[PDB]
């Protein structure tokens, strides 16, 4: 059961990493 | 004065080629004479064991620290 | 004076000179295992 | 004689440890 | 806009929701102080207080109840063991419902100092801006502590109108709520006198109201005003960190070390109680003289208390526990039930064998039987082969000596070992390690969970007080460097630094 | 294997509750940049 | 200037070589007095009474082996002082008890709140922000938790890391031995800050210096720049879209990026301090209870973390007798763990 | 804005902010206290460091009783 | 007593939003493992 | 594991290309630190009170978010002036050539290890005049390898040396 | 007085006479005489 | 008294994902009509 705890939390993690690389705030000039 | 400067000036070396020396030398009499091990209580290479000190020597006491180090350093 | 490359030359000399000393008493005498 | 006072308080023990050192390469057992 | 690290630093001019604030932190740090000491209440087993003591349930904040005065419960028991027939108000329960009762009042006082926050008390006559007098709020806040330390000093701890505090005796075995007389001179400063605490509580209190009197009435001068920003409260922030990481540590070092204001009975035994054999000496001693006066072992050593014989055991040490082994220290070793006895062991001969204790740095040390002199006689080899330190081949027995286990002398090498291995632990006894379903892995007493937060919290403080007296000294350049900066950090540009009148 | 059972509360309760945190911060503000607007 | 306190200020805060300031009241002689003291222990002292070992260039360690060993653990946690009851006055004894580990250390932790200070002056008389000596907040907490917290959670002063190379190694191999240090999840967020500030100034390094612009023709580029320039001499936009497509992710702001430089060392530093400030209670993740009990009840459950359990025991078994020659530990050749052959 | 009897009451211990001794004041005393202070401090560390052995001052868990 | 001249926005940028969560999910994928022991 | 089995075996610690690996990490993290703290420093104002610093440096912009000159003489005034790295760009390569160079001394010491060209073994290095062994701390870290040895693999060896 | 206490008092009385006063007396000279212009 | 285990991050969890919702729900609006003003 800790297996699902484990899995959830690191599957979580990879799920942060894939939304912070491809729907990160788009870099722009200012003016 | 900037450091090249002063390194590179006659008098520097005047100076350096004197005293540097005088105390690189002092240093070796310093230990030759055998005084570091006695300012410092280091045993020398004939010292670290004696009769009935064929073990190492630990202080044990906190208070008495003194007075055992001198019945183990008695030699 | 005197040109700093010949006293860094002669400077670096010494320098080196002393740590080979320390390395020839890291193979001979006190501090080496024979 | 503050550059003086840093400078060799720095350098006279550097130069006297070094020669003690030099000395005690050669104490030899 | 104001990111997330930022936000309470609303509140920074605004005095009177700065008190709101302040309220809101007192009414919570109130319910959880009502709130543990119900939620241990709830879980405390009162029935046994020589073999099952606060400190082995992982009663946290009882222990600062009972420390100065609160021994008692409405249920009908005492922390000293004895059953009380009327408690009054002030027991477990009624300080914890008078916490959560306060910290009700803090929330609605809070409420009301956030709504109502333009008061005219927190506003400069000279300028109408808001602003706090801090060095005459600081005088006053003086004189209210002074008034306070004095009032425990000579009224709480010394009895007069108040229960005392707890004393023990050296060894923890008789120890109680009584008042303690002020100990004026250099007794006073012995960390383990109790009555240095009263001596201390009285005369500084007196000298805190005459600091009081002082800052109401001095004003700061000029010179330290602008040194130190005091118009600037983020300096009493930094100044308040710094004395609250200060005295963090000192609280630290007196729970890790001990002294009168820790006793053992209330947070278990010190490390050091252990490392130099202080029950195991004292236990000594006692069955000396009774052999001294004509009794034998078993008589000897029937007279040794069970609280004394459990000190003297590594499990009650605070230094044998681990950062994730949660929980009381029942749940560890178990729920200690009695005492089997001194194990003496007599080797084949006859001579006394002596089991080297374990120390608390190992996890897992070795059994080995030292001699009287200590050249090891016996042990239990890890290699069986060629072995020479055999208890098979010079052959022990265990005679126990007082304790349930009494008057039994087992001398077959199986049950020898097996109490070998016990005697490396200290003392001997029995465990119920089914009712917490304890698991075998010793725990940390509060003692030393005690030490372990407020070390850590001590250095975290020290880098909050370095950031906040940062951040006081450093204002006028928090939004970043302008260009004046380029001038005078120029090198030979000025004699002095910083001072610009120099060249 | 003995694991404990408030440790599952613990882990899950402190990552949920920064977890929620975080994402209304986020959420208010981005509300605020778009009623701003 | 008139007042007597002016002028000892306007000199102190004098523009010449060595910045001196207040805080060079406190900095210039401790600091002095602990690394001549280094020196003087590493070079002369011995200890032979109280570690049971040679530590000194005189007794003929070299600079591996030579160290300012820890005091004698009968000592306690005495502050050593040369005039205390220990020594009384005598340098000899006092050199022999290792009280020159105390001297040593209790004038490094005035030296770095010197050194920190003099952070702090000259900061505020340039006229920047104070983010170094907050930055310098890390060391001391390493120090401060490592060598002076640590051994006054433990029995004495004997168990602080003797100041050396190879003491330093033991140091090392004795926590984990002790402790199971590794395994704590403390220390572990510490190498995380370590090994991820030395990976940002590398690749911080690398990217400045491979998006520089060209403001020269020489091939050596290192002279194409101006100090007192206005104007950036990398591009930001270049390196922000290498990361970006070669990594996903990059910084674009400058300012955040040196913050998270500075961020990520001191937060493992403070972190691992506070692993440190655990193991001087023995408050140790040495052990997880579940895999200990299914060994137990399971002779073939095997994980890693076994056996590095085992190999603890091997090293506290074999370690403790030199180690703690105070002890006495008499551990025969019956007892000791082993495995076969070697 | 909002007058009240404890505002008022307590109006006059809120009146002086920013007032400032001219010149450098107590600092004399303050630092001759900080002194004395210090001394104190390191008095009671060196007893229960037992650096500094008192007289009737036994600083064990013995002396308890 | 009215609106209070100390009101302030807050902010919590995406980046800043992915930089928590990443945190949070990381310290809870660490003590994890120390928790349920 | 593969940690203390390797020092067991190896003695990685008193290896010198470990040590400048040990020198690598922990230089690049002080350099990590203390270039981030001299940058943000420094910060040119361009930012309001209520307004995080990072906010006033704009993406693409070409003017520098920070006064190099500022950091340059506060670091200079700390240390020594001629310490100060007054060129950045020979400052940054500095940041990327000290860890950089590092870590290939320590994987390069790995690698020779592999084939078994150990760290210094200065046991018994030291002998009083008789010739008995005076340890030093080479011995009692050697204390702590042997055990590591003796536990790692307990089932593996048959035979006393660990050649393989 | 213990021997103790008269070692701790001696300590004071060198400390006062051997780093304090030496160096406060010594900056007081320098500061006085090596005098920053138009302060 | 034996009551399941799993119930306690049922009930908790279930009382605690809602409520968080509805929170951010609030802030965000609140927000944003600060925002427009
Ligand atoms: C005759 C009257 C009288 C008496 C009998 C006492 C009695 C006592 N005072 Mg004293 N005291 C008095 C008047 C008196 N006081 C007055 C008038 C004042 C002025 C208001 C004080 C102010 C005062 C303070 C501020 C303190 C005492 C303390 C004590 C206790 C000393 C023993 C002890 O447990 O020390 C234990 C504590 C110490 C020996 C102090 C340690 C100090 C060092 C320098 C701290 C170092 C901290 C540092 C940050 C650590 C860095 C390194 C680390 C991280 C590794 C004792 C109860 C101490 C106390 O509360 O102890 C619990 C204490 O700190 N008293
Ligand atoms: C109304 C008064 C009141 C009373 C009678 C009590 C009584 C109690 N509280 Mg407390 N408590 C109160 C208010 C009160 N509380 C409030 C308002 C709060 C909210 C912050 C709390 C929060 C609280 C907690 C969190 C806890 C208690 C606990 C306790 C118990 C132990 C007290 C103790 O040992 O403190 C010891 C206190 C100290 C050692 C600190 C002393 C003061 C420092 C050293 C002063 C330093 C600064 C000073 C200005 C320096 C200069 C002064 C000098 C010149 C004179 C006891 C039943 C404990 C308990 O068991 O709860 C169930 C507990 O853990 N209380
Ligand atoms: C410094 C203050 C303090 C101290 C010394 C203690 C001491 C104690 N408490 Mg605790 N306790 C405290 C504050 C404190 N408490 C507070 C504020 C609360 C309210 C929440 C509680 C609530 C509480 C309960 C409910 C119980 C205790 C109990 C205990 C005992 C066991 C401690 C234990 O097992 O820790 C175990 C600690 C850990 C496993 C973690 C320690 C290491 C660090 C701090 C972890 C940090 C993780 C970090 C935040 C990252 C998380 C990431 C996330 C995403 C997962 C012990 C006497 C037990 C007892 O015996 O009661 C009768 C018990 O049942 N305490
Ligand atoms: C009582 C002491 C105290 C007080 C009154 C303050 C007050 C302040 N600090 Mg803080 N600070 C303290 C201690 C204190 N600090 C300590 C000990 C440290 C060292 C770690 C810091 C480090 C620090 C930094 C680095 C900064 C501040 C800042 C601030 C300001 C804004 C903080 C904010 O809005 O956080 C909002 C916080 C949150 C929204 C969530 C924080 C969640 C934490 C990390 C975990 C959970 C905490 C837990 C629930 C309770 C802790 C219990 C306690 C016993 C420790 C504010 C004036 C900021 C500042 O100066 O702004 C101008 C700032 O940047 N502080
Ligand atoms: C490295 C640590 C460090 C650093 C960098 C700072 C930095 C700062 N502190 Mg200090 N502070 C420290 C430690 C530190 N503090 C400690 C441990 C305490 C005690 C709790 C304080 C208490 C404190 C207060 C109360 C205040 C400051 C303030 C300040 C600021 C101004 C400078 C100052 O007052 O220096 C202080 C000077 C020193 C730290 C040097 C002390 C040197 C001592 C006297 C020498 C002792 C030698 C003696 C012989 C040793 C005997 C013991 C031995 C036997 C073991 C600045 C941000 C002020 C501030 O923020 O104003 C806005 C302020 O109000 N600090
Ligand atoms: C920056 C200056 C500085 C600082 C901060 C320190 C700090 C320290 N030194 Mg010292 N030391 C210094 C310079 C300094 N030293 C210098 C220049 C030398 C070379 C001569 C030494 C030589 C030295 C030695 C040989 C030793 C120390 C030691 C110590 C420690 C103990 C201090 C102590 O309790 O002394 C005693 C207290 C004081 C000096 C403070 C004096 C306070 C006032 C001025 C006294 C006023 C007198 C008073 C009115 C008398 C009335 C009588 C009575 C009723 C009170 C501490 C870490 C000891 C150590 O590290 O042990 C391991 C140690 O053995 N130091
Ligand atoms: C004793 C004692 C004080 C020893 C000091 C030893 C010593 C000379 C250290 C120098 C270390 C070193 C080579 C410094 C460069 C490291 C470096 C990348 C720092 C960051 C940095 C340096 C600058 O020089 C400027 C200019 C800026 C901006 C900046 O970040
Ligand atoms: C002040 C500035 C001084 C410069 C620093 C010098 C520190 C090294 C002293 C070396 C010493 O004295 O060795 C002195 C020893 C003396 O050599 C020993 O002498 C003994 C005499 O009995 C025996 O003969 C030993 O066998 C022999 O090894 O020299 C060495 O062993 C040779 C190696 C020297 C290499 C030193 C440079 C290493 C750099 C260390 C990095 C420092 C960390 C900086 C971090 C920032
Ligand atoms: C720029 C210029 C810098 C100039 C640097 C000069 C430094 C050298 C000064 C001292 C050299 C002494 C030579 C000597 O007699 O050998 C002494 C020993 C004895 O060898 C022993 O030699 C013995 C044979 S024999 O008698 O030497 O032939 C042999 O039996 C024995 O096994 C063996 O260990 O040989 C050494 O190991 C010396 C190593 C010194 C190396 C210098 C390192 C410089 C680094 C910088
Ligand atoms: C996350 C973390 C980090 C570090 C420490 C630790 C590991 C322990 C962990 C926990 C930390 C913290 C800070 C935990 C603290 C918990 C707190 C403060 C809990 C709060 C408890 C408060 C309670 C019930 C208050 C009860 C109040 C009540 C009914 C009030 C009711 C009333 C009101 C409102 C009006 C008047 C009448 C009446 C009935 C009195
Ligand atoms: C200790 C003590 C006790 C009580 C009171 C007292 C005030 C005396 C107090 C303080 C004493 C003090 C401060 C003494 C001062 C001693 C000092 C500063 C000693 C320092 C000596 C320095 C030494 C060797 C330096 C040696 C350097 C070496 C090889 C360098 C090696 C190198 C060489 C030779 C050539 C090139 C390569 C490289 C690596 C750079
Ligand atoms: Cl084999
Ligand atoms: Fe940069």
Same mark, same amino acid.
Request: aromatic share 14%; hydrophobic share 30%; charged share 20%.
């Given at each position: 059961m800790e297996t699902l705890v484990y899995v959830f939390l690191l599957a979580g993690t990879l799920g942060v990493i894939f939304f912070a690389v491809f729907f990160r705030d788009p870099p722009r000039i200012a003016k | 004065r900037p450091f090249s400067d002063i390194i590179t000036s006659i008098r520097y070396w005047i100076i350096h080629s004197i005293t540097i020396p005088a105390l690189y030398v002092a240093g070796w009499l310093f230990v030759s004479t055998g005084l570091a091990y006695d300012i410092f209580g280091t045993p020398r290479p004939n010292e670290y064991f004696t009769q009935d000190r064929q073990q190492v020597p630990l202080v044990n006491d906190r208070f008495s620290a003194k007075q055992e180090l001198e019945d183990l350093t008695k030699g | 004076r005197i040109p700093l490359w010949l006293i860094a030359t002669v400077g670096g000399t010494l320098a080196l000179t002393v740590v080979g000393i320390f390395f020839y008493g890291s193979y001979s005498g006190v501090g080496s295992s024979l | 004689t503050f550059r003086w006072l840093a400078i060799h308080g720095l350098a006279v023990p550097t130069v006297f440890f070094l020669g003690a050192i030099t000395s005690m390469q050669f104490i030899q057992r | 806009g104001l990111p997330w690290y930022r936000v309470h630093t609303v509140v920074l001019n605004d005095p009177g929701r700065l008190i709101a604030v302040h309220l809101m932190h007192t009414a919570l740090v109130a319910g959880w102080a009502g709130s543990m000491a119900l939620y241990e209440l709830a879980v405390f087993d009162p029935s046994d207080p020589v073999l099952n003591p606060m400190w082995r349930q992982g009663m946290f904040v009882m222990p600062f109840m009972a420390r100065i005065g609160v021994t008692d419960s409405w249920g009908g028991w005492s922390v000293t063991g004895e059953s009380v027939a009327n408690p009054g108000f002030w027991s477990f329960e009624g300080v914890a419902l008078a916490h959560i009762g306060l910290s009700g009042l803090l929330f609605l006082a809070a409420v009301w100092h956030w709504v109502y926050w333009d008061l005219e008390l927190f506003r400069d006559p000279r300028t109408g801006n808001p602003a706090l007098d801090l060095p005459k709020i600081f005088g006053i806040h003086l004189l209210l502590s002074g008034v306070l330390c004095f009032g425990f000093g000579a009224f709480h701890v010394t009895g007069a109108w108040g229960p005392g505090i707890w004393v023990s005796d050296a060894y923890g075995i008789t120890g109680k709520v009584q008042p303690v007389a002020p100990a004026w001179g250099?007794?006073? +400063?012995?960390?383990?006198?109790?009555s240095g605490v009263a001596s201390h509580h009285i005369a500084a209190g007196i000298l805190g109201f005459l600091a009081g009197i002082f800052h109401i009435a001095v004003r700061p001068p000029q010179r330290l005003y602008r040194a130190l920003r005091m118009g600037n409260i983020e300096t009493v922030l930094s100044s308040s960190i710094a004395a609250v990481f200060w005295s963090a540590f000192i609280t630290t070092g007196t729970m890790w070390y001990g002294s009168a204001t820790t006793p053992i009975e209330l947070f278990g035994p010190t490390r050091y109680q252990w490392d130099s054999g202080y029950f195991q000496q004292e236990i000594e001693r006692r069955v000396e003289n009774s052999l001294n006066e004509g009794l034998n072992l078993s008589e000897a050593w029937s007279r040794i208390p069970d609280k004394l014989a459990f000190y !003297?055991?590594?499990?009650?040490?605070?230094? *044998?526990?681990?950062? +994730?082994?949660?929980?009381?220290?029942? *749940?560890?070793?178990?729920?200690a039930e009695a005492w089997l006895g001194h194990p003496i062991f007599q080797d084949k001969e006859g001579k006394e064998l002596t089991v080297r204790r374990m120390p608390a740095f190992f996890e897992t040390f070795p059994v080995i039987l030292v001699d009287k !002199?200590?050249?090891?006689?016996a042990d239990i080899p890890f290699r069986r082969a060629e072995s020479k330190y055999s208890i098979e081949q010079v052959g022990v027995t265990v005679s126990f000596y007082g304790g349930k286990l009494n008057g039994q002398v087992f001398k077959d090498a199986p049950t020898v070992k097996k109490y070998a291995r016990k005697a490396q632990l200290g003392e001997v006894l029995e465990f119920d390690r089914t009712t917490l379903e304890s698991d075998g892995v010793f725990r940390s007493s509060p003692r030393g969970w005690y030490t372990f937060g407020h070390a850590n919290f001590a250095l975290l403080f020290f880098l909050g007080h370095l950031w906040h007296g940062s951040r006081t000294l450093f204002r006028d350049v928090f939004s970043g460097i302008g260009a004046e900066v380029t001038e005078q950090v120029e090198f030979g540009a000025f004699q002095k630094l910083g001072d610009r009148s120099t060249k | 294997m003995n694991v404990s059972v408030a440790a599952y509360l613990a882990v899950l309760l402190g990552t949920f509750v920064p977890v929620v945190f975080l994402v209304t911060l986020y959420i208010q503000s981005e509300s605020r940049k778009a009623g701003s607007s | 200037g008139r007042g007597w306190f002016d002028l000892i200020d306007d000199w102190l805060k004098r523009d010449r070589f060595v910045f001196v300031g207040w805080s060079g009241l406190l900095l210039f002689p401790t600091s002095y007095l602990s690394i001549g003291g280094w020196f003087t222990g590493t070079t002369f002292?011995?200890?032979? $009474?109280?570690?049971?070992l040679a530590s000194s260039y005189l007794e003929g360690c070299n600079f591996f082996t030579a160290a300012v060993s820890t005091p004698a653990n009968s000592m306690g946690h005495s502050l050593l002082l040369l005039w205390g009851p220990e020594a009384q006055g005598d340098f000899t004894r006092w050199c022999q008890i290792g009280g020159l580990w105390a001297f040593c250390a209790l004038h490094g932790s005035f030296a770095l709140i010197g050194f920190c200070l003099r952070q702090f002056e000259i900061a505020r008389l340039v006229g920047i922000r104070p983010y170094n000596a907050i930055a310098f907040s890390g060391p001391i907490a390493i120090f401060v938790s490592v060598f002076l917290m640590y051994p006054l959670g433990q029995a004495s002063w004997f168990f602080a890391p003797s100041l050396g190379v190879a003491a330093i190694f033991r140091f090392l191999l004795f926590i984990q031995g002790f402790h199971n240090f590794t395994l704590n999840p403390f220390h572990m967020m510490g190498v995380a800050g370590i090994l991820g500030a030395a990976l940002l100034c590398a690749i911080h390094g690398a990217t400045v210096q491979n998006t520089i612009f060209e403001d020269g023709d020489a091939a050596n580029t290192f002279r194409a720049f101006t100090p007192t320039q206005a104007e950036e001499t990398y591009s930001m936009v270049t390196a922000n879209r290498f990361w970006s497509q070669i990594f996903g992710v990059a910084f674009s702001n400058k300012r955040w990026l040196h913050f998270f430089m500075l961020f990520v060392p001191l937060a493992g530093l403070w972190t691992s301090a506070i692993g440190i400030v655990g193991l001087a209670l023995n408050?140790?993740? $040495?052990?997880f209870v579940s895999q200990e009990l299914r060994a137990a009840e399971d002779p073939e459950f095997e994980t890693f973390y076994t056996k590095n359990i085992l190999l603890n025991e091997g090293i506290r078994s074999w370690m403790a007798a030199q180690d703690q020659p105070h002890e006495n530990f008499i551990f025969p050749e019956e007892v000791l763990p082993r495995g076969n052959a070697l | 804005a909002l007058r009240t009897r404890l505002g008022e009451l307590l109006r006059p211990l809120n009146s002086e902010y920013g007032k400032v001794a001219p010149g450098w004041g107590t600092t004399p005393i303050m630092g001759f206290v900080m002194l004395l202070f210090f001394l104190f401090l390191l008095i009671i560390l060196q007893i229960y460091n037992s650096s500094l052995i008192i007289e009737n001052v036994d600083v064990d868990w013995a002396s308890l009783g | 007593s009215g609106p209070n001249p100390n009101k302030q926005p807050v902010e919590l940028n995406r980046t800043s939003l992915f930089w928590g969560l990443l945190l949070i999910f990381v310290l809870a994928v660490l003590f994890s493992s120390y928790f349920f022991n | 594991n593969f940690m203390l089995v390797f020092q067991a075996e190896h003695n990685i610690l008193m290896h010198p290309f470990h040590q400048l690996g040990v020198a690598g990490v922990f230089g690049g993290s002080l350099f990590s630190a203390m270039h981030g703290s001299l940058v943000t420093s420094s910060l040119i104002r361009e930012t309001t009170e209520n307004e995080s610093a990072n906010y006033g440096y704009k993406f693409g912009q070409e003017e520098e978010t920070y006064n190099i000159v500022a950091a340059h003489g506060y670091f200079g005034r700390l240390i020594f002036q001629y310490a100060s790295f007054n060129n950045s760009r020979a400052l940054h390569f500095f940041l990327g050539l000290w860890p950089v160079v590092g870590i290939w001394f320590t994987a390069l010491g790995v690698m020779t290890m592999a084939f078994n060209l150990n760290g210094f073994n200065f046991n018994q290095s030291v002998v009083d005049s008789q010739g008995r062994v005076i340890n030093t701390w080479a011995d009692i870290l050697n204390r702590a390898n042997l055990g590591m040895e003796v536990m790692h693999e307990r089932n593996a060896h048959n035979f006393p040396l660990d050649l393989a | 007085m213990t021997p103790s206490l008269s070692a701790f008092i001696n300590s004071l009385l060198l400390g006062l006479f051997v780093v304090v006063i030496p160096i406060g007396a010594a900056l007081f000279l320098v500061s006085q005489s090596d005098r920053v212009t138009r302060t």
């Open positions: - | - | - | - | 250099a007794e006073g +400063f012995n960390p383990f006198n109790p !003297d055991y590594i499990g009650n040490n605070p230094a *044998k526990g681990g950062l +994730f082994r949660a929980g009381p220290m029942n *749940k560890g070793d178990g729920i !002199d200590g050249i090891i006689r | - | 002292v011995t200890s032979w $009474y109280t570690h049971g408050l140790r993740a $040495y052990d | - | - | - | -």
